[PDB]
Amino acid sequence: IVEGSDAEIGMSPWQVMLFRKSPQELLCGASLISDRWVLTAAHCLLYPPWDKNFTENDLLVRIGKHSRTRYERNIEKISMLEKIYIHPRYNWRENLDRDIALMKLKKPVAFSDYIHPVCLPDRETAASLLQAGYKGRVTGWGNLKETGQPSVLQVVNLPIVERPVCKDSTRIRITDNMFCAGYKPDEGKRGDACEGDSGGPFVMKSPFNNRWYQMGIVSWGEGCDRDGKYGFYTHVFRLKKWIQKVIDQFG
């Protein structure tokens, strides 16, 4: 995260770190949506242009974390993966359309002060909140600048951007399964996700019921925190029927 700040303890208790077993390293962010399901970006797991195609046994998830690099004894919980599910129409060839994946854990994780699931939006919460100028929050352990790494989880609040401005900022084809967020050059304030934040959550706190909802997944950007560029996020609500179908049939 660029131009963010250190998270408070327990501020993002749904935040998950996707961790490579060998060599031991951060791969991506992710989020906890129930005691046995973790949501992330498909490109964290499958990206053939970079020879990336992880299997379950390659990976672990670390839940309840704050420090990036420490083993947070008595706080974090480390879970193995039973199964990866990637959206069947994830478009890694062109523009990362439908950049969404689920991971089922081998055993349920116990909730705690530090470990708690985020809500997924209903149609009405999505319609109400996914409006240009409304701010969400992005969290992760990724790089602090495009060209460096945080001690602890970073947080930044960013406004959703009008769809024409998103489209006019890039040559990539934008789809209805994406939204973009960030400040405009004339707005002064700054901030973005960056390398290593992919797969983590874009959340909004509903003013109707005071619950946090995951509206987006950190998906892609061209650089980090560049003027006139914006971060792109997977539109979780638009893909929720697939999420539900996976959970209903494999959970």
Binding site: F19, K21, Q24, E25, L26, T69, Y71, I78, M80
Partner: peptide
């Protein structure tokens, strides 16, 4: 760069 995690999670 990362602190070693317990061996039980790698077995």
């Amino acid at each position: 760069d990362f602190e070693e995690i317990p061996e039980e999670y790698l077995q």
